Design an enzyme around this catalytic site. Structure first.
Site, PDB file in Angstrom:
ATOM      1  N   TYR A  35      -3.790   0.529  -5.512  1.00  0.00           N
ATOM      2  CA  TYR A  35      -4.264  -1.125  -5.269  1.00  0.00           C
ATOM      3  C   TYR A  35      -3.966  -0.564  -3.716  1.00  0.00           C
ATOM      4  O   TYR A  35      -5.170  -0.414  -2.691  1.00  0.00           O
ATOM      5  CB  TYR A  35      -3.088  -1.862  -5.305  1.00  0.00           C
ATOM      6  CG  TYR A  35      -3.504  -2.337  -3.435  1.00  0.00           C
ATOM      7  CD1 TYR A  35      -3.702  -3.904  -3.741  1.00  0.00           C
ATOM      8  CD2 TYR A  35      -2.594  -2.490  -2.344  1.00  0.00           C
ATOM      9  CE1 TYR A  35      -4.007  -4.816  -2.749  1.00  0.00           C
ATOM     10  CE2 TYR A  35      -2.631  -3.793  -1.666  1.00  0.00           C
ATOM     11  CZ  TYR A  35      -3.230  -4.468  -1.856  1.00  0.00           C
ATOM     12  OH  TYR A  35      -3.038  -5.998   0.107  1.00  0.00           O
ATOM     13  N   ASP A  95       0.536 -13.232   4.059  1.00  0.00           N
ATOM     14  CA  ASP A  95       0.247 -11.792   4.225  1.00  0.00           C
ATOM     15  C   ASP A  95      -0.040 -12.461   5.954  1.00  0.00           C
ATOM     16  O   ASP A  95      -1.079 -12.808   6.453  1.00  0.00           O
ATOM     17  CB  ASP A  95      -0.791 -10.842   4.401  1.00  0.00           C
ATOM     18  CG  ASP A  95      -0.719  -9.355   4.455  1.00  0.00           C
ATOM     19  OD1 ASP A  95      -0.459  -9.607   6.286  1.00  0.00           O
ATOM     20  OD2 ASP A  95      -0.548  -8.935   3.525  1.00  0.00           O
ATOM     21  N   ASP A 125       3.217  -0.907  10.419  1.00  0.00           N
ATOM     22  CA  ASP A 125       3.847   0.128   9.223  1.00  0.00           C
ATOM     23  C   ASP A 125       4.277  -1.668   8.412  1.00  0.00           C
ATOM     24  O   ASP A 125       4.883  -2.823   9.199  1.00  0.00           O
ATOM     25  CB  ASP A 125       5.554   0.166   9.400  1.00  0.00           C
ATOM     26  CG  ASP A 125       4.953   1.820  10.160  1.00  0.00           C
ATOM     27  OD1 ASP A 125       4.300   2.411   9.166  1.00  0.00           O
ATOM     28  OD2 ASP A 125       5.685   2.214  11.473  1.00  0.00           O
ATOM     29  N   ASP A 140       5.043  -4.462   1.337  1.00  0.00           N
ATOM     30  CA  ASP A 140       4.256  -5.448   0.291  1.00  0.00           C
ATOM     31  C   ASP A 140       4.912  -5.273  -1.138  1.00  0.00           C
ATOM     32  O   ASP A 140       5.892  -4.204  -1.780  1.00  0.00           O
ATOM     33  CB  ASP A 140       3.157  -4.863   0.045  1.00  0.00           C
ATOM     34  CG  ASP A 140       2.052  -5.522   0.172  1.00  0.00           C
ATOM     35  OD1 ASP A 140       2.207  -5.369   1.473  1.00  0.00           O
ATOM     36  OD2 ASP A 140       0.700  -4.729   0.122  1.00  0.00           O
TER      37      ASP A 140
END
Lengths: 123, 123
Positions: free
Chosen positions: A15, A39, A96, A99
């Site tokens: 990913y 997100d 930074d 996930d």
């Protein structure tokens, strides 16, 4: 099938590989057709491949790298730390992010959440 | 109150500080009275301070350090990467973990999830 702990580390590393090159079609295909993305987390989710492809097209020309190993469990979940380097309006930044993903019985991303806010931005 | 993004980074860093020294009473008090912990995630949760104190007493003589910055959102959530170094049955190990926490309207940990499995162990 439900990826194993080792499969989760490989998918999640792929990913970041895809985000780094910017292959938008290949990224989109890692998600389930009806996957939802949050997100940054705290923000309302985007649902389905159409909306996800649009979200990704909107954001890519970046450099992204894993900054530590992918943490994976036995139930299709994984979490990974990474950094994104961009250049916003002429100025170069770094972000930074962490996930957290849940995979489905097919090895596709069913749900994704990204943790970061302005406190993780170095502009 | 609900810690802000900056408060979340400080609380979470304190947490690793406390785990590192091994001050069990101070760790326990960071959690809400009825907090639940899932460590490793995929495992059934432990609820309440009594059970959490027992869980922590069971595991501490370790060295723990943050290996990257604390990622924090605006809704009381945070995620951080860290490493734990121990010596299991004479052999020294290391475990890479990612903790995700949700804080309450009082700045106490309401829920905690730790992501790691054997693929993150270096024995």
């Amino acid at each position: 099938n439900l990826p194993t702990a080792q499969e989760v580390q490989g998918l999640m590393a792929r990913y970041i590989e895809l985000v780094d090159v910017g292959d938008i079609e290949a990224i989109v295909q890692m998600f389930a057709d009806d996957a939802t993305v949050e997100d940054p987390f705290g923000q309302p989710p985007i649902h389905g491949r159409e909306q996800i492809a649009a979200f990704f097209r909107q954001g890519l020309k970046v450099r992204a790298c894993l900054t530590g190993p992918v943490r994976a469990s036995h139930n299709g979940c994984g979490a990974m730390p990474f950094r994104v380097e961009m250049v916003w309006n002429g100025q170069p930044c770094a972000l930074d992010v962490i996930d957290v993903m849940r995979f489905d019985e097919h090895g596709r991303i069913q749900t994704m959440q990204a943790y970061w806010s302005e406190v993780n931005l170095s502009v």
